[PDB]
């Protein structure tokens, strides 16, 4: 960068040089009317070119050369060092007329050097390497650079503020700023919502981190110390990306000089950086297990008692929660969705929280939370793919799925607050389905992915009706058609519902149909917007019933909602149609998994309560390792 | 892409099939109970492979193949051809136990094959190309595809729509779509106010074209007529892109399939194109002038007779306004701007209208209008540069150059609203310059682009107080000190302003000293966000006086503030100090300029006031010819 720095002549100039810049001078404005030629002089540490025309000539400290005088010959004035008490640096010319050799007039310019650079951990190693070329730009990508903030979840404390980025102002140069000058750091008012900073404003008199810039805060004079000097600064993000925030912010420091009262002071040297504020992102259940959370009533005994025996095959812990005033029963599932953020110096998961009433818990300090209608709100119809390739284009941490309704059909949908929520995220790249032909409206309610075993390969999970009658039809031709479901749950009894009872309901036949045509609506977008084939999908058997506005529920308990946790599954128990004492279901889904290696446990979650209507009463959510990939690695389409 | 359609059984299932998709097809839901296996037959055009685990093989029309019924076993039905009249397209299924080889059952799929495209200029060459693959999305630079739609910036009448955008829907089918099928054109809410879209309903009564998309209007069933056919639309947008719109809308076809009473219609098929809307670009001064606009008072008899001279020296046309009860003195500068707008298949040039006191003009048919505080609002602080290139990256439109203040003064900025729109066109990606310095705030005030003659080449022009003083103080010596100012301004007379007179003022040396500083901080910014050097900056005298705000107004007319026809430059009259009968300050210019092969013609503007008190009565305005280089051709930063 190359500064303006004039002389003024009988006199002196004074000014300040920020290393990393230089002068160009003019000598010629000063020179008294009628000179001709001019010399110069010069210390040390000042290199100095004549520039004539653009041809530029080093000169010596003490020289006698002269120049004849132009207003396109000029001075080049460098500095590669910072000044000290034992400097004086200096650029002296002296003026000549046509009558001799002594000079009839002189101009000087007095020098100090300083070195001043906002310095962040731009190259994203954890480290905050001295002046990142780079660090005022943010670049996606493997190559990609500039510095990542984490936005804060939860006089201050430093062990605080250890989550939080650094900033690092460093500085060179003598005891003290010649007079008149002071140093700002500053953000614009726009940003001042997106974040904070904060320091030790009096070192001698304690540790306390102060709040300098931030809401109402758009700028902090920052006290110069002499030799070289580091002012260490913290940064916070305060909100996530969203519909009218790219997660971009930025601050600057400035060199200000006092002009004089009633003017303003002027920006000598400016120094920025950028940061990016880290995007929430959501676990699929391919990633390793941590932590399972379920939810349930106190006496559902049965339920605990099996999610326990679940859980200890596995090395996961299980954390378990009951029901609370302000919640519907499936909260943990429903309500709460675990997530994560990460910068290169740390990350942490992240849970989202929509109470059905509002709040009035929380598992945990390990954990960020943000708190925030239909019931395509829930979490429950939010889900996220495994990494995908599709047509070329990779999604290296999967993409977030959200049910909908068609565009013109004027049903349900996610309001526009969440779903432009995840969109911002950008690194998820969601894809909507169609959920609205349910009538509690969940993605979950249809579909889920599970590892295959032993491989990086994974299933894609549809519930389907045709499977059911398929099998049902099966069994009955076999001579089973006598065989009754949900045995043992005694408020069904007086029901008598037989394979045959389900096969001859010509109604529940058509509805079912129906039905199928939605799931296999799903399943082409899916297989379109997921990259997936016929191989990568396994058909579980589902029924439902059809309510006044067309809209299904479960007949029996939808299978395909199941616990994870790498090869081992927990899955609702259905209650189906006894045969040889086994259920038909539970067998027929052994039958399409174990092959595979997954193991399957069933789960029975609703004998507590005597009977099933097509709601569940329990909820379970699983809190995951996160990707091995740095989201900063990816490079997003360009919105 | 892949699509789901399942056999049902006793029965048949009929089908639209859509070419450029194909069907996967399960034959084991309709299988009978305790069937065993299945064989086929199909129609000549009808391609069937059966895939069983995922491989694949083709069968033919008439064979007695058999295979195992397994639910991995499943049909892939391709079709090339639409349907005509004379097609029957089918495919048969039989099922067979184990007992005997006559079929047990049969169950059928009819299809009725149809090519459904919506058509765009994707790769921009005025044509509507035949399903360009990349029509859904947009991108830029040279090998960039995507369509591009004009903002409208003036029943109706199709000639009254030769400006739009064309959009056309090609179908090919049998004399009609089959029973409970219907074509559906449409657009989000969210861009129903940046598009409309127009057609002609009934061309049996006539050529009436109707607005069929747009506000309130988010859908419109289509007629399908069969045989091949051409549906023709025209596209409007409905503004430029700003703060919170990117310039990208799309549109929508899909083929909605009736289910039932009450029930949502299925989108079978969808097609999307996308369009960006054309962004304002502003013309800098180094284009081809094509038209003069000036505005003075009917009187000033000298400046219309010089410019009409300037202007006959030239192949332009001058068109001379007058003023206004709702306008500036200068509004044809400072409340006009001229700029373009392009699509591949046409242009025009667009003007930006911000009367002082709103509307009550405007001047032809051939300009587009676009009609809307501190003085920094006007055009007069907006320019823009040639195209450069900085630190590699290249500006090939040049950049938007705008008049503000210090981050942290306090001070005037031009409203957010016209910053926003500045930068959200993108493609002259804009610079804050300090214009808050001068009482009115102008850029145009202080600095100007002129192209160098014979060359591909420009100089940045800069007023200078330091040339001013120079020049004035070298007179002095030479004898000249009380050769007089604003010779022949009766009003003037009485202050005998001589050289003498102005450098004896020392408060206003002071007030220019710092007026230079302010002039080189935008020096520094201008060759930094330029790539400019000294070689390509000439500094012109200038001298201001200081108000009570600390804020700069010209002492003689700004010499700056030009009219640039190529080589030919109408340059305000200086009214400067008078040596040998003539204006030194004229002498100095010329010499400056002429050798580059510049012609000056001085244009006296303040005469017909007897006096100048640093405002100034009249304006001017070049429309040029666009850039040759195309717009969609530049590839901006990612935002
Ligand atoms: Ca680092
Ligand atoms: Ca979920
Ligand atoms: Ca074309
Ligand atoms: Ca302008």
Same mark, same amino acid.
């Given at each position: 960068?190359?500064?303006?720095?004039?002389?003024?002549?009988?006199?002196?100039?004074?000014?300040?040089?920020?290393?990393?810049?230089?002068?160009?001078?003019?000598?010629?404005?000063?020179?008294?009317?009628?000179?001709?030629?001019?010399?110069?002089?010069?210390?040390?540490?000042?290199?100095?070119?004549?520039?004539?025309?653009?041809?530029?000539?080093?000169? @010596?400290?003490?020289?006698?050369?002269?120049?004849?005088? +132009?207003?396109?010959?000029?001075?080049?004035?460098?500095?590669?060092?910072?000044?000290?008490?034992?400097? +004086?640096?200096?650029?002296?010319?002296?003026?000549?007329?046509?009558?001799?050799?002594?000079?009839?007039?002189?101009?000087?310019?007095?020098?100090?050097?300083?070195? &001043?650079?906002?310095?962040?951990? @731009?190259?994203?190693?954890?480290?905050?390497?001295?002046?990142?070329?780079?660090?005022?730009?943010?670049?996606?990508?493997?190559?990609?650079?500039?510095?990542?903030?984490?936005?804060?979840?939860?006089?201050?404390?430093?062990?605080?503020?250890?989550?939080?980025?650094?900033?690092?102002?460093?500085?060179?140069?003598?005891?003290?700023?010649?007079?008149?000058?002071? &140093?700002?750091?500053? /953000?614009?008012?726009?940003?001042?919502?997106?974040?904070?900073?904060?320091?030790?404003?009096?070192?001698?008199?304690?540790?306390?981190?102060?709040?300098?810039?931030?809401?109402?805060?758009?700028?902090?004079?920052?006290?110069?110390?002499?030799?070289?000097?580091?002012?260490?600064?913290?940064?916070?993000?305060?909100?996530?990306?969203?519909?009218?925030?790219?997660?971009?912010?930025?601050?600057?420091?400035?060199?200000?000089?006092?002009?004089?009262?009633?003017?303003?002071?002027?920006?000598?040297?400016?120094?920025?950086?950028?940061?990016?504020?880290?995007?929430?992102?959501?676990?699929?259940? &391919?990633?390793?297990?941590?932590?399972?959370?379920?939810?349930?009533?106190?006496?559902?005994?049965?339920?605990?008692?099996?999610?326990?025996?679940?859980?200890?095959?596995?090395?996961?812990?299980?954390?378990?929660?009951?029901?609370?005033?302000?919640?519907?029963?499936?909260?943990?599932?429903?309500?709460?969705?675990?997530?994560?953020?990460?910068?290169?110096?740390?990350?942490?998961?992240?849970?989202?929280?929509?109470?059905?009433?509002?709040?009035?818990?929380?598992?945990?300090?390990?954990?960020?939370?943000?708190?925030?209608?239909? *019931?395509?709100?829930?979490? #429950?119809?939010?889900?996220?793919?495994?990494?995908?390739?599709?047509? #070329?284009?990779?999604?290296?941490?999967?993409?977030?799925?959200?049910?909908?309704?068609?565009?013109?059909?004027?049903?349900?949908?996610?309001?526009?607050?969440?779903?432009?929520?995840?969109?911002?995220?950008?690194?998820?790249?969601?894809?909507?389905?169609?959920?609205?032909?349910?009538?509690?409206?969940?993605?979950?309610?249809?579909?889920?992915?599970?590892?295959?075993?032993?491989?990086?390969?994974?299933?894609?999970?549809?519930?389907?009706?045709?499977?059911?009658?398929?099998?049902?039809?099966?069994?009955?031709?076999?001579?089973?058609?006598?065989?009754?479901?949900?045995?043992?749950?005694?408020?069904? +009894?007086?029901?008598?519902?037989? /394979?045959?009872?389900?096969? *001859?309901?010509? *109604?529940?036949?058509?509805?079912?149909?129906?039905?199928?045509?939605?799931?296999?609506?799903?399943?082409?977008?899916?297989?379109?917007?997921?990259?997936?084939?016929?191989?990568?999908?396994?058909?579980?058997?589902?029924?439902?019933?059809?309510?006044?506005?067309?809209?299904?529920?479960?007949?029996?308990?939808?299978?395909?909602?199941?616990?994870?946790?790498?090869?081992?599954?927990?899955?609702?128990?259905?209650?189906?149609?006894?045969?040889?004492?086994?259920?038909?279901?539970?067998?027929?889904?052994?039958?399409?998994?174990?092959?595979?290696?997954?193991?399957?446990?069933?789960?029975?979650? &609703?004998? @507590?309560?005597?009977?099933?209507?097509?709601?569940?009463?329990?909820?379970?959510?699983?809190?995951?390792?996160?990707?091995?990939?740095?989201?900063?690695?990816?490079?997003?389409?360009?919105?």
């Amino acid at each position: 960068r190359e500064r303006t720095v004039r002389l003024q002549y009988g006199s002196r100039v004074e000014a300040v040089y920020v290393l990393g810049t230089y002068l160009w001078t003019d000598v010629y404005s000063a020179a008294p009317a009628g000179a001709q030629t001019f010399s110069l002089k010069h210390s040390e540490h000042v290199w100095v070119e004549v520039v004539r025309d653009g041809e530029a000539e080093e000169v @010596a400290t003490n020289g006698k050369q002269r120049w004849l005088l +132009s207003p396109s010959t000029t001075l080049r004035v460098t500095m590669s060092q910072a000044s000290t008490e034992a400097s +004086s640096d200096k650029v002296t010319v002296n003026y000549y007329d046509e009558e001799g050799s002594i000079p009839i007039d002189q101009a000087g310019l007095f020098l100090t050097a300083i070195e &001043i650079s906002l310095d962040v951990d @731009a190259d994203r190693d954890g480290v905050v390497e001295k002046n990142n070329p780079k660090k005022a730009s943010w670049t996606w990508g493997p190559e990609g650079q500039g510095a990542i903030l984490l936005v804060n979840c939860d006089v201050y404390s430093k062990e605080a503020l250890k989550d939080m980025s650094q900033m690092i102002l460093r500085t060179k140069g003598p005891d003290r700023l010649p007079a008149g000058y002071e &140093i700002v750091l500053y /953000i614009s008012m726009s940003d001042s919502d997106k974040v904070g900073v904060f320091y030790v404003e009096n070192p001698f008199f304690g540790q306390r981190y102060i709040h300098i810039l931030g809401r109402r805060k758009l700028y902090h004079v920052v006290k110069y110390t002499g030799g070289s000097a580091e002012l260490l600064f913290f940064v916070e993000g305060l909100c996530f990306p969203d519909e009218g925030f790219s997660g971009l912010v930025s601050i600057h420091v400035s060199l200000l000089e006092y002009m004089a009262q009633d003017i303003p002071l002027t920006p000598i040297f400016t120094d920025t950086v950028i940061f990016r504020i880290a995007p929430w992102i959501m676990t699929p259940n &391919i990633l390793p297990p941590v932590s399972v959370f379920v939810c349930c009533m106190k006496d559902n005994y049965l339920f605990l008692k099996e999610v326990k025996n679940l859980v200890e095959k596995t090395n996961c812990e299980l954390k378990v929660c009951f029901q609370y005033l302000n919640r519907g029963d499936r909260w943990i599932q429903d309500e709460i969705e675990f997530g994560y953020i990460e910068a290169p110096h740390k990350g942490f998961p992240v849970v989202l929280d929509s109470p059905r009433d509002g709040n009035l818990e929380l598992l945990g300090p390990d954990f960020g939370y943000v708190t925030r209608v239909t *019931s395509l709100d829930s979490f #429950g119809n939010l889900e996220v793919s495994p990494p995908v390739t599709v047509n #070329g284009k990779t999604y290296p941490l999967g993409r977030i799925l959200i049910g909908s309704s068609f565009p013109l059909s004027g049903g349900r949908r996610m309001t526009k607050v969440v779903r432009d929520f995840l969109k911002a995220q950008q690194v998820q790249a969601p894809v909507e389905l169609y959920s609205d032909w349910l009538t509690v409206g969940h993605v979950d309610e249809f579909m889920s992915f599970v590892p295959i075993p032993g491989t990086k390969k994974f299933l894609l999970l549809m519930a389907s009706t045709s499977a059911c009658y398929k099998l049902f039809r099966e069994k009955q031709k076999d001579g089973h058609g006598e065989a009754i479901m949900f045995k043992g749950l005694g408020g069904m +009894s007086s029901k008598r519902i037989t /394979i045959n009872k389900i096969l *001859s309901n010509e *109604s529940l036949v058509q509805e079912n149909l129906y039905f199928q045509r939605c799931l296999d609506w799903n399943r082409d977008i899916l297989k379109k917007e997921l990259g997936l084939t016929e191989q990568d999908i396994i058909d579980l058997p589902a029924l439902f019933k059809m309510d006044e506005d067309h809209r299904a529920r479960a007949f029996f308990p939808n299978m395909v909602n199941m616990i994870v946790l790498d090869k081992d599954l927990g899955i609702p128990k259905p209650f189906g149609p006894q045969v040889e004492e086994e259920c038909c279901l539970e067998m027929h889904v052994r039958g399409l998994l174990e092959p595979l290696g997954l193991e399957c446990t069933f789960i029975d979650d &609703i004998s @507590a309560y005597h009977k099933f209507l097509g709601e569940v009463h329990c909820g379970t959510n699983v809190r995951r390792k996160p990707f091995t990939f740095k989201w900063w690695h990816m490079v997003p389409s360009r919105r």
